[PDB]
């Protein structure tokens, strides 16, 4: 009746954070085996080294340091019971790094944390009760009447669920302001190599810790608030014949993950049908007229979607910059890129946050194979 | 601009389903110890027998039958590894029993299943990737473009979280119809008795399997659609002095849960602070003038909140009827009661779905201590 807002959900602030311990890819193939204790795996180390050159990854952030892996020998083994050794770390550490990322959004946002109405926590590393939304509500100290949505164990595609969810919450409750925190810790994941299970090692060359947060609200007050991007629409579809492409099992051994299909080709074979549903109602066909943000599941996906669509080099530059300096941070990784792009547009004198263009796309791909496609609109300066 | 609906979110249909194997409480205190092989625990059997008649519980439904507990001896032990034995079972069965409930709402609703726009699955039994929301889209066969929210490992308080969430999705997307499925299987929970951790024994005399589903939408088309209840408001608060009241750990032994406070007194000491915020802006103080629906976490909470407020006996009659023939079905139980109330109103010739009244309250309490309070409105005949 009178509870609803007036305008579209708008990203007003963006914050990012990652663990302090940095681990480079040039040294990882050695470090990984010398901590796992897998010296005998000769060719497996040869297949893994060249995979650490597949990456296009330079640095990644790991809460799991060298010191911390020598009192946990069964986190360095392939299949050894360690769910407790894993989650004890990430039940506590996920909201801690979440607070660090959230706090820089509240700071740049510049209003009292008490003005936040909803909280959306998203993670795929661990599950607890009370949840990390409870933990991050206490760490940040928000109103005990905040309305929170806990997105537990979602996948790489959760980077768009938080915008799809933030859009409805903010626009359906007037004056509401939604805080959204994405945070992943690659501790539940880390495992040892196996020459009979090459799929567990792709993740060992891509994943890295990270947390991301943004403030979403409708009707941005001038003078005090500054809008960055508008959330115009967000749809979620499943790719035909993909049941099993991305699998995820939480065992008493940790987070088991599998690839069973050519997940790069699966998306570029279908990614045009999701663009047209969104941009045909606006008469847009040239896909270099848009600014692009794609969840970097791997260098293959960015290359195969670039060729399939013949995109210019500049379109996925911010998407490739983050994957270079962070690895694949699962859901949090998408929101990093949208920060790297507005900071890039501002500096290069672009007329608009979206590298100068007006409309834009955001892409996430996870277990399903599910594809979330959110259309974005950019704002000046 | 034009995507949002006109009226309030409205639950239009309700469906219920439960496992076939029924287990009675009169025989449970014995059966429980006699399957675990715990006859030697003499007084523990008497302390538990005094708890299964504390219950006010008659029957409960368990997918874990007599046959299946003798091929899984480590689910019948107190602290024995069985996360794999648990999740293998319930990763499949939660969406299956979800299908049984979802189909029964679609039936009463009476429109094409292709008309469902969003899906919200909520459960606390197991975790998987892809999630149980993916599983039920295939089981029901809905549009591969459905919009899903997977609420994994939430708690007893999720019965209002899905109504708080369904309200925003339906009211912010015009003509949308949202299906929401609650489903619980008390297999992750089931444990052996222990005289050193009496907290594991409350759940063994209260929890029982069950699934619930409803269709929620805004702007109900006449002729075809029939509104049952309106969702007017829904707030989420945490009780002061509750750190640790309800705890939940998903370990390699199952879902460990602990009680450390008098959660009945915790609620009745605070349930008035939530009552007025919702009804003071409508000029309602007498809390027997509304129809009541409370999550039956246990007879103590219903009795202590009944006394705290001096409520009439008939108010929580439907709340205790569901707990009588079902036990505590965690999140799904709330939606059961709202079905037990409308089917009760129709038969008894009440003028309104809400036992004859117009305004009503719905309450959900879980880990936090978090309290979800949803305001409902009833409709005639």
């Amino acid at each position: 009746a009178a509870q609803r807002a007036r305008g579209p959900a708008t990203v007003l602030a963006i914050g990012t954070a990652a663990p302090a311990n940095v681990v480079y890819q040039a040294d990882y193939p050695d470090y990984y085996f010398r901590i796992t204790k897998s010296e005998h795996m000769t060719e497996l180390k040869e297949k893994f080294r060249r995979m650490c050159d597949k990456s296009m990854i330079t640095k990644r952030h790991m809460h799991l340091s060298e010191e911390l892996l020598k009192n946990n020998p069964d986190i360095c083994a392939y299949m050894a019971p360690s769910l407790d050794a894993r989650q004890d770390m990430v039940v506590v550490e996920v909201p801690k790094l979440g607070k660090e990322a959230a706090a820089k959004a509240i700071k740049e946002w510049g209003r009292p944390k008490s003005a936040i109405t909803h909280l959306i926590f998203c993670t795929t590393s661990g599950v607890d009760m009370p949840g990390a939304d409870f933990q991050l509500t206490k760490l940040l100290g928000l109103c005990p009447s905040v309305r929170r949505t806990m997105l537990y164990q979602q996948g790489c595609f959760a980077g768009g669920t938080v915008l799809r969810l933030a859009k409805d919450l903010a626009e359906n409750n007037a004056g509401a302001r939604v805080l959204v925190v994405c945070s992943e810790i690659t501790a539940v994941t880390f495992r040892g190599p196996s020459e009979t299970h090459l799929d567990s090692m792709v993740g060992q060359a891509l994943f890295g810790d990270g947390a991301s947060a943004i403030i979403v609200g409708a009707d941005p007050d001038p003078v005090i608030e500054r809008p960055l991007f508008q959330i115009v629409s967000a749809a979620q579809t499943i790719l035909p014949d993909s049941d099993g492409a991305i699998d995820g099992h939480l065992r008493e051994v940790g987070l088991t993950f599998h690839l069973l299909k050519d997940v790069p080709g699966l998306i570029s074979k279908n990614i045009e049908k999701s663009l047209k549903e969104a941009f045909a109602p606006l008469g847009i066909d040239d896909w270099n007229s848009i600014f692009w943000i794609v969840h970097p599941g791997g260098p293959a996906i960015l290359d195969q979607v670039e060729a399939k669509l013949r995109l210019k080099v500049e379109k996925l530059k911010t998407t490739r910059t983050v994957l270079s300096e962070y690895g694949n941070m699962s859901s949090a990784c998408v929101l990093f890129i949208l920060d790297e792009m507005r900071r890039n547009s501002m500096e290069e004198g672009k007329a608009t946050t979206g590298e100068g263009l007006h409309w834009g796309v955001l892409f996430g791909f996870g277990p399903g194979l599910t594809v979330e496609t959110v259309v974005l609109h950019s704002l000046p300066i």
Side-chain angles (χ1 to χ4, degrees), chain A residues 35-56:
Chain A
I35 274 61
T36 296
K37 180 60 176 55
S38 292
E39 298 71 358
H40 36 74
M41 292 178 229
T42 53
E43 71 174 26
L44 203 50
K45 92 90 174 181
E46 272 297 74
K47 311 250 194 95
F48 188 66
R49 169 189 260 205
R50 291 189 304 270
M51 280 193 271
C52 291
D53 297 293
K54 298 201 322 171
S55 53
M56 311 306 282

mmCIF file of all heavy atoms in Angstrom, chain A residues 35-56:
data_model
loop_
_atom_site.group_PDB
_atom_site.id
_atom_site.type_symbol
_atom_site.label_atom_id
_atom_site.label_comp_id
_atom_site.label_asym_id
_atom_site.label_seq_id
_atom_site.Cartn_x
_atom_site.Cartn_y
_atom_site.Cartn_z
ATOM 1 N N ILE A 35 53.668 -29.564 0.050
ATOM 2 C CA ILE A 35 52.796 -29.570 1.219
ATOM 3 C C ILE A 35 51.891 -30.795 1.216
ATOM 4 O O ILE A 35 51.700 -31.437 2.252
ATOM 5 C CB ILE A 35 51.978 -28.264 1.272
ATOM 6 C CG1 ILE A 35 52.771 -27.161 1.974
ATOM 7 C CG2 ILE A 35 50.657 -28.493 1.982
ATOM 8 C CD1 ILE A 35 54.074 -26.807 1.287
ATOM 9 N N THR A 36 51.311 -31.119 0.058
ATOM 10 C CA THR A 36 50.530 -32.344 -0.067
ATOM 11 C C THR A 36 51.370 -33.583 0.216
ATOM 12 O O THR A 36 50.826 -34.627 0.592
ATOM 13 C CB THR A 36 49.920 -32.442 -1.467
ATOM 14 O OG1 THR A 36 48.987 -31.373 -1.665
ATOM 15 C CG2 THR A 36 49.209 -33.775 -1.647
ATOM 16 N N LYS A 37 52.688 -33.495 0.036
ATOM 17 C CA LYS A 37 53.562 -34.666 0.071
ATOM 18 C C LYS A 37 53.185 -35.635 -1.054
ATOM 19 O O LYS A 37 52.660 -36.731 -0.840
ATOM 20 C CB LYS A 37 53.504 -35.346 1.444
ATOM 21 C CG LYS A 37 54.389 -36.575 1.571
ATOM 22 C CD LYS A 37 55.848 -36.227 1.330
ATOM 23 C CE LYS A 37 56.748 -37.429 1.556
ATOM 24 N NZ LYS A 37 56.339 -38.601 0.731
ATOM 25 N N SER A 38 53.477 -35.190 -2.274
ATOM 26 C CA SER A 38 53.152 -35.934 -3.487
ATOM 27 C C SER A 38 54.326 -35.893 -4.456
ATOM 28 O O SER A 38 54.158 -35.671 -5.660
ATOM 29 C CB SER A 38 51.883 -35.386 -4.142
ATOM 30 O OG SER A 38 50.745 -35.644 -3.336
ATOM 31 N N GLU A 39 55.538 -36.094 -3.934
ATOM 32 C CA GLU A 39 56.727 -36.072 -4.780
ATOM 33 C C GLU A 39 56.719 -37.207 -5.797
ATOM 34 O O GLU A 39 57.215 -37.040 -6.917
ATOM 35 C CB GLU A 39 57.987 -36.156 -3.916
ATOM 36 C CG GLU A 39 58.170 -34.995 -2.941
ATOM 37 C CD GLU A 39 57.171 -35.030 -1.794
ATOM 38 O OE1 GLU A 39 56.315 -35.944 -1.778
ATOM 39 O OE2 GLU A 39 57.231 -34.139 -0.918
ATOM 40 N N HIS A 40 56.176 -38.367 -5.424
ATOM 41 C CA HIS A 40 56.187 -39.518 -6.321
ATOM 42 C C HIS A 40 55.346 -39.282 -7.571
ATOM 43 O O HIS A 40 55.655 -39.825 -8.637
ATOM 44 C CB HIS A 40 55.703 -40.759 -5.572
ATOM 45 C CG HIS A 40 54.626 -40.473 -4.572
ATOM 46 N ND1 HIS A 40 53.326 -40.193 -4.935
ATOM 47 C CD2 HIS A 40 54.658 -40.426 -3.219
ATOM 48 C CE1 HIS A 40 52.604 -39.983 -3.849
ATOM 49 N NE2 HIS A 40 53.388 -40.119 -2.794
ATOM 50 N N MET A 41 54.292 -38.471 -7.467
ATOM 51 C CA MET A 41 53.409 -38.174 -8.596
ATOM 52 C C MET A 41 54.162 -37.340 -9.630
ATOM 53 O O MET A 41 54.085 -36.109 -9.669
ATOM 54 C CB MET A 41 52.154 -37.462 -8.104
ATOM 55 C CG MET A 41 51.244 -38.343 -7.265
ATOM 56 S SD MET A 41 49.794 -37.484 -6.636
ATOM 57 C CE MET A 41 49.880 -37.960 -4.912
ATOM 58 N N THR A 42 54.901 -38.040 -10.492
ATOM 59 C CA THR A 42 55.765 -37.401 -11.478
ATOM 60 C C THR A 42 54.959 -36.718 -12.577
ATOM 61 O O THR A 42 54.963 -35.487 -12.683
ATOM 62 C CB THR A 42 56.717 -38.424 -12.101
ATOM 63 O OG1 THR A 42 55.967 -39.541 -12.600
ATOM 64 C CG2 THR A 42 57.719 -38.915 -11.069
ATOM 65 N N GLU A 43 54.275 -37.508 -13.409
ATOM 66 C CA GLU A 43 53.523 -36.922 -14.514
ATOM 67 C C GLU A 43 52.318 -36.134 -14.018
ATOM 68 O O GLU A 43 51.919 -35.151 -14.653
ATOM 69 C CB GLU A 43 53.100 -38.009 -15.508
ATOM 70 C CG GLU A 43 52.014 -38.952 -15.020
ATOM 71 C CD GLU A 43 51.555 -39.912 -16.106
ATOM 72 O OE1 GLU A 43 52.352 -40.197 -17.026
ATOM 73 O OE2 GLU A 43 50.399 -40.382 -16.039
ATOM 74 N N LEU A 44 51.726 -36.545 -12.893
ATOM 75 C CA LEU A 44 50.647 -35.760 -12.300
ATOM 76 C C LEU A 44 51.114 -34.346 -11.978
ATOM 77 O O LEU A 44 50.346 -33.385 -12.103
ATOM 78 C CB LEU A 44 50.121 -36.455 -11.044
ATOM 79 C CG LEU A 44 48.691 -36.105 -10.625
ATOM 80 C CD1 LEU A 44 47.737 -36.235 -11.805
ATOM 81 C CD2 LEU A 44 48.240 -36.986 -9.471
ATOM 82 N N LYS A 45 52.370 -34.202 -11.544
ATOM 83 C CA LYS A 45 52.939 -32.872 -11.347
ATOM 84 C C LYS A 45 53.190 -32.175 -12.677
ATOM 85 O O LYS A 45 53.146 -30.941 -12.749
ATOM 86 C CB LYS A 45 54.229 -32.967 -10.528
ATOM 87 C CG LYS A 45 55.508 -33.089 -11.347
ATOM 88 C CD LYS A 45 56.090 -31.722 -11.680
ATOM 89 C CE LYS A 45 57.437 -31.838 -12.377
ATOM 90 N NZ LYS A 45 58.014 -30.498 -12.684
ATOM 91 N N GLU A 46 53.451 -32.945 -13.738
ATOM 92 C CA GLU A 46 53.646 -32.352 -15.058
ATOM 93 C C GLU A 46 52.319 -31.905 -15.654
ATOM 94 O O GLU A 46 52.236 -30.837 -16.274
ATOM 95 C CB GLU A 46 54.330 -33.354 -15.990
ATOM 96 C CG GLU A 46 55.850 -33.344 -15.950
ATOM 97 C CD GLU A 46 56.434 -32.021 -16.407
ATOM 98 O OE1 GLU A 46 56.358 -31.040 -15.637
ATOM 99 O OE2 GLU A 46 56.959 -31.959 -17.541
ATOM 100 N N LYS A 47 51.269 -32.710 -15.482
ATOM 101 C CA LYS A 47 49.941 -32.297 -15.916
ATOM 102 C C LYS A 47 49.432 -31.112 -15.107
ATOM 103 O O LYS A 47 48.685 -30.278 -15.632
ATOM 104 C CB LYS A 47 48.967 -33.471 -15.808
ATOM 105 C CG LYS A 47 49.474 -34.766 -16.422
ATOM 106 C CD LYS A 47 48.715 -35.115 -17.690
ATOM 107 C CE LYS A 47 48.986 -36.552 -18.110
ATOM 108 N NZ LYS A 47 47.940 -37.489 -17.613
ATOM 109 N N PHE A 48 49.826 -31.018 -13.835
ATOM 110 C CA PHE A 48 49.365 -29.926 -12.983
ATOM 111 C C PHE A 48 50.127 -28.631 -13.240
ATOM 112 O O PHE A 48 49.544 -27.545 -13.165
ATOM 113 C CB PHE A 48 49.477 -30.323 -11.512
ATOM 114 C CG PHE A 48 48.855 -29.335 -10.571
ATOM 115 C CD1 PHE A 48 47.487 -29.120 -10.581
ATOM 116 C CD2 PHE A 48 49.635 -28.613 -9.687
ATOM 117 C CE1 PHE A 48 46.908 -28.209 -9.721
ATOM 118 C CE2 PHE A 48 49.064 -27.699 -8.824
ATOM 119 C CZ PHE A 48 47.698 -27.498 -8.841
ATOM 120 N N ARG A 49 51.427 -28.713 -13.533
ATOM 121 C CA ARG A 49 52.179 -27.493 -13.811
ATOM 122 C C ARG A 49 51.613 -26.768 -15.025
ATOM 123 O O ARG A 49 51.314 -25.570 -14.963
ATOM 124 C CB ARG A 49 53.661 -27.804 -14.024
ATOM 125 C CG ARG A 49 54.423 -26.602 -14.567
ATOM 126 C CD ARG A 49 55.838 -26.936 -15.003
ATOM 127 N NE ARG A 49 56.831 -26.565 -14.001
ATOM 128 C CZ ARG A 49 58.101 -26.291 -14.287
ATOM 129 N NH1 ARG A 49 58.523 -26.350 -15.543
ATOM 130 N NH2 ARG A 49 58.946 -25.956 -13.322
ATOM 131 N N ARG A 50 51.458 -27.477 -16.145
ATOM 132 C CA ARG A 50 50.879 -26.852 -17.327
ATOM 133 C C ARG A 50 49.453 -26.376 -17.084
ATOM 134 O O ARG A 50 48.989 -25.464 -17.778
ATOM 135 C CB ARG A 50 50.919 -27.814 -18.515
ATOM 136 C CG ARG A 50 52.321 -28.081 -19.042
ATOM 137 C CD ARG A 50 52.285 -28.853 -20.350
ATOM 138 N NE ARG A 50 51.542 -30.103 -20.232
ATOM 139 C CZ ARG A 50 52.086 -31.268 -19.897
ATOM 140 N NH1 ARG A 50 53.386 -31.349 -19.642
ATOM 141 N NH2 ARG A 50 51.331 -32.354 -19.813
ATOM 142 N N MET A 51 48.747 -26.967 -16.116
ATOM 143 C CA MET A 51 47.436 -26.440 -15.754
ATOM 144 C C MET A 51 47.561 -25.118 -15.011
ATOM 145 O O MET A 51 46.685 -24.255 -15.137
ATOM 146 C CB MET A 51 46.667 -27.458 -14.917
ATOM 147 C CG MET A 51 46.005 -28.550 -15.736
ATOM 148 S SD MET A 51 44.808 -29.487 -14.774
ATOM 149 C CE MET A 51 45.863 -30.763 -14.099
ATOM 150 N N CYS A 52 48.640 -24.934 -14.251
ATOM 151 C CA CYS A 52 48.913 -23.655 -13.610
ATOM 152 C C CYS A 52 49.409 -22.620 -14.607
ATOM 153 O O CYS A 52 49.688 -21.482 -14.218
ATOM 154 C CB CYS A 52 49.934 -23.823 -12.481
ATOM 155 S SG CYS A 52 49.316 -24.741 -11.054
ATOM 156 N N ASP A 53 49.531 -23.002 -15.879
ATOM 157 C CA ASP A 53 49.743 -22.060 -16.962
ATOM 158 C C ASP A 53 48.538 -21.943 -17.882
ATOM 159 O O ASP A 53 48.457 -20.977 -18.648
ATOM 160 C CB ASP A 53 50.968 -22.480 -17.789
ATOM 161 C CG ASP A 53 52.253 -22.448 -16.987
ATOM 162 O OD1 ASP A 53 52.691 -21.341 -16.601
ATOM 163 O OD2 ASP A 53 52.815 -23.532 -16.730
ATOM 164 N N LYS A 54 47.597 -22.893 -17.821
ATOM 165 C CA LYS A 54 46.241 -22.635 -18.297
ATOM 166 C C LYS A 54 45.657 -21.382 -17.665
ATOM 167 O O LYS A 54 44.943 -20.616 -18.323
ATOM 168 C CB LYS A 54 45.325 -23.820 -17.979
ATOM 169 C CG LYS A 54 45.677 -25.143 -18.621
ATOM 170 C CD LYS A 54 44.450 -26.050 -18.638
ATOM 171 C CE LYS A 54 43.629 -25.902 -17.361
ATOM 172 N NZ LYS A 54 42.317 -26.606 -17.457
ATOM 173 N N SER A 55 45.959 -21.160 -16.384
ATOM 174 C CA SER A 55 45.113 -20.323 -15.538
ATOM 175 C C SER A 55 44.912 -18.931 -16.125
ATOM 176 O O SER A 55 43.791 -18.411 -16.146
ATOM 177 C CB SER A 55 45.712 -20.228 -14.136
ATOM 178 O OG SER A 55 47.063 -19.802 -14.189
ATOM 179 N N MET A 56 45.991 -18.296 -16.574
ATOM 180 C CA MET A 56 46.036 -16.840 -16.673
ATOM 181 C C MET A 56 45.903 -16.203 -15.295
ATOM 182 O O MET A 56 45.501 -15.040 -15.174
ATOM 183 C CB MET A 56 44.955 -16.303 -17.619
ATOM 184 C CG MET A 56 44.897 -17.005 -18.970
ATOM 185 S SD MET A 56 46.484 -17.015 -19.827
ATOM 186 C CE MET A 56 46.525 -15.346 -20.477
#
